[PDB]
């Protein structure tokens, strides 16, 4: 963190921790009983494995009755994802079994209609912090409300300089100091999944630095198809 606050425990029952070898790698979002959406860059690299997903968690380290760790039957990165690009940066993970659903675990509706989130809309992003930003990292789930930034301005020569295609969206990042982006994590507007974090901003510095998110509606055809 240097954006935000501790979330209410289990009030985002869609939130997932994508894990490598039992350590938090990336955020993700439960989009169907057996399927979690995250970002391709997360699981990018090569060797392995023991990629799993933790559902029903608030703390990454402490006992909680709802916590369940799922192995993954299949990792499906968007075919057009590339290591050297923030395009098509989505990742679907098929869980070993249907998630057991309840107050702490519950898929989130996601936007199928390909329309942009209106600029100014307040959306919610949640996650758990990187490298080991404090060994247990941030240990409990954090979130913050960010206003959506118009694509035009996001594309300014000082913001993101034409990088933001119509398949991407932006949020004002955060003034005062810097940064965040769990990655793979979700951007939720009015209770609907609209975006997934991409390395926006992993080049942090300005005042009006914006976060970059992949628009899930733009990939609705690919998502649904992997699900069927």
mmCIF file with all atom_site columns, N, CA, C and O in Angstrom, residues 34 50 76 90 149 189 194:
data_model
loop_
_atom_site.group_PDB
_atom_site.id
_atom_site.type_symbol
_atom_site.label_atom_id
_atom_site.label_alt_id
_atom_site.label_comp_id
_atom_site.label_asym_id
_atom_site.label_entity_id
_atom_site.label_seq_id
_atom_site.pdbx_PDB_ins_code
_atom_site.Cartn_x
_atom_site.Cartn_y
_atom_site.Cartn_z
_atom_site.occupancy
_atom_site.B_iso_or_equiv
_atom_site.pdbx_formal_charge
_atom_site.auth_seq_id
_atom_site.auth_comp_id
_atom_site.auth_asym_id
_atom_site.auth_atom_id
_atom_site.pdbx_PDB_model_num
ATOM 1  N N  . UNK A 1 34  ? -16.148 -22.334 -11.043 1.00 0.00 ? 34  UNK A N  1
ATOM 2  C CA . UNK A 1 34  ? -14.858 -23.001 -11.211 1.00 0.00 ? 34  UNK A CA 1
ATOM 3  C C  . UNK A 1 34  ? -13.769 -22.213 -11.930 1.00 0.00 ? 34  UNK A C  1
ATOM 4  O O  . UNK A 1 34  ? -12.774 -22.777 -12.351 1.00 0.00 ? 34  UNK A O  1
ATOM 5  N N  . UNK A 1 50  ? 2.620   -25.302 -9.147  1.00 0.00 ? 50  UNK A N  1
ATOM 6  C CA . UNK A 1 50  ? 1.990   -25.064 -7.880  1.00 0.00 ? 50  UNK A CA 1
ATOM 7  C C  . UNK A 1 50  ? 1.588   -23.607 -7.992  1.00 0.00 ? 50  UNK A C  1
ATOM 8  O O  . UNK A 1 50  ? 2.088   -22.713 -7.297  1.00 0.00 ? 50  UNK A O  1
ATOM 9  N N  . UNK A 1 76  ? -5.179  -20.644 -18.621 1.00 0.00 ? 76  UNK A N  1
ATOM 10 C CA . UNK A 1 76  ? -5.474  -20.225 -19.978 1.00 0.00 ? 76  UNK A CA 1
ATOM 11 C C  . UNK A 1 76  ? -5.225  -18.709 -20.145 1.00 0.00 ? 76  UNK A C  1
ATOM 12 O O  . UNK A 1 76  ? -6.126  -17.895 -19.944 1.00 0.00 ? 76  UNK A O  1
ATOM 13 N N  . UNK A 1 90  ? -4.969  -11.023 -20.005 1.00 0.00 ? 90  UNK A N  1
ATOM 14 C CA . UNK A 1 90  ? -5.931  -11.757 -19.206 1.00 0.00 ? 90  UNK A CA 1
ATOM 15 C C  . UNK A 1 90  ? -5.547  -13.213 -19.059 1.00 0.00 ? 90  UNK A C  1
ATOM 16 O O  . UNK A 1 90  ? -4.847  -13.769 -19.889 1.00 0.00 ? 90  UNK A O  1
ATOM 17 N N  . UNK A 1 149 ? -10.873 7.610   -15.324 1.00 0.00 ? 149 UNK A N  1
ATOM 18 C CA . UNK A 1 149 ? -10.296 8.689   -16.120 1.00 0.00 ? 149 UNK A CA 1
ATOM 19 C C  . UNK A 1 149 ? -10.630 8.513   -17.612 1.00 0.00 ? 149 UNK A C  1
ATOM 20 O O  . UNK A 1 149 ? -10.566 7.398   -18.142 1.00 0.00 ? 149 UNK A O  1
ATOM 21 N N  . UNK A 1 189 ? -17.307 -1.832  -10.644 1.00 0.00 ? 189 UNK A N  1
ATOM 22 C CA . UNK A 1 189 ? -18.119 -0.605  -10.711 1.00 0.00 ? 189 UNK A CA 1
ATOM 23 C C  . UNK A 1 189 ? -19.588 -0.961  -10.523 1.00 0.00 ? 189 UNK A C  1
ATOM 24 O O  . UNK A 1 189 ? -20.139 -1.734  -11.288 1.00 0.00 ? 189 UNK A O  1
ATOM 25 N N  . UNK A 1 194 ? -15.562 -4.682  -14.206 1.00 0.00 ? 194 UNK A N  1
ATOM 26 C CA . UNK A 1 194 ? -15.295 -3.964  -15.458 1.00 0.00 ? 194 UNK A CA 1
ATOM 27 C C  . UNK A 1 194 ? -13.849 -4.054  -15.929 1.00 0.00 ? 194 UNK A C  1
ATOM 28 O O  . UNK A 1 194 ? -13.588 -4.020  -17.126 1.00 0.00 ? 194 UNK A O  1
#
